[PDB]
Amino acid sequence: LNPMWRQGMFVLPFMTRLGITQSWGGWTISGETATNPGIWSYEGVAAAHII
Amino acid sequence: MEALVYTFLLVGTLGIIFFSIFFRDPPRMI
Amino acid sequence: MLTLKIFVYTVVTFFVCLFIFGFLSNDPARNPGK
């Protein structure tokens, strides 16, 4: 009932568009949790752009 | 609160009008 | 974690060996001298 586009979210539905579907908090987009976040989570993509 | 912002903007526009009229560079000759 | 541990030992021992074989490599003659 509270998707991404109700919140005014802008650059996260491009990472989710090209497949970045997991964060370091453990939560995902569809609702369940995934175990391994890997190097490439949302915060990792952001920090890589800062670098 | 915002009324002071409105009044400050109008008075600042009038002040720039004043300085533009009186403190311009003199248009000088040849 | 072992993949990290090999890398940490590699970097540490590389810099320490660079240190030791730097100071063995003719240090007190690279001065302005006499």
Binding site: - | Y6, L9, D25 | -
Partner: protein, 37 residues
């Protein structure tokens, strides 16, 4: 040539000063009511 052979100078006279300041305040006076909503 190690010093730059294209170091050039910006120039902005008093007429353009008054035009720019008047433009910024008129833009502010116009858009401020819609920004504050």
């Amino acid at each position: 040539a190690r010093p730059n052979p294209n170091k050039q100078v910006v120039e902005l006279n008093r007429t353009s000063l008054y035009w720019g300041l008047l433009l910024i305040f008129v833009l502010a006076v116009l858009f401020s009511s819609y920004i504050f909503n």
